[PDB]
DNA sequence: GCATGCATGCGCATGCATGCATGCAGCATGCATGCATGC
């Protein structure tokens, strides 16, 4: 996912080509919009890191970024550990 | 030449499947006992 970040933000000349694990080099410098495609996935990470730092930019004062998700679970409130789900603000659209 | 990340091999905990036994209740059977009945 950070490759694809990378290279999608055409940043890995900024960044760097080799597969350093280092990414402070983006997320320091980081109006970009971003569309996630079955997002229930995603809250299967080990951590939810990447969730977590979208969130926390999304609630940050540096710049802006909108996050849209599409789900078809109807609980993926209970599948997002405590701390993003307060991060997270509680924009629910329903498809029925 | 070195660092790094990935594939592999092994140890550990766990849940589940299997073996194993014992106590109870029902039933069948054989015996003890009561009854009839004649001589």
Same mark, same amino acid.
């Given at each position: 996912?950070? +490759?694809?970040?990378?290279?999608?933000?055409?940043?890995?000349?900024?960044?760097?080509? +080799?597969?350093?694990?280092?990414?402070?080099?983006?997320?320091?410098?980081?109006?970009?919009?971003?569309?996630?495609?079955?997002?229930?996935?995603?809250?299967?990470?080990?951590?939810?890191?990447?969730?977590?730092?979208?969130?926390?930019?999304?609630?940050?004062?540096?710049?802006?970024?909108?996050?849209?998700?599409?789900?078809?679970?109807?609980?993926?409130?209970?599948?997002?550990? +405590?701390?993003? +789900?307060?991060?997270?603000?509680?924009?629910?659209?329903?498809?029925?």
């Amino acid at each position: 996912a950070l +490759k694809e970040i990378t290279r999608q933000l055409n940043l890995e000349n900024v960044v760097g080509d +080799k597969v350093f694990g280092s990414f402070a080099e983006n997320l320091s410098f980081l109006p970009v919009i971003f569309i996630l495609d079955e997002f229930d996935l995603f809250a299967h990470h080990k951590n939810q890191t990447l969730l977590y730092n979208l969130f926390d930019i999304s609630q940050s004062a540096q710049t802006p970024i909108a996050v849209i998700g599409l789900t078809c679970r109807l609980d993926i409130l209970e599948l997002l550990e +405590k701390r993003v +789900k307060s991060r997270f603000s509680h924009r629910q659209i329903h498809l029925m």
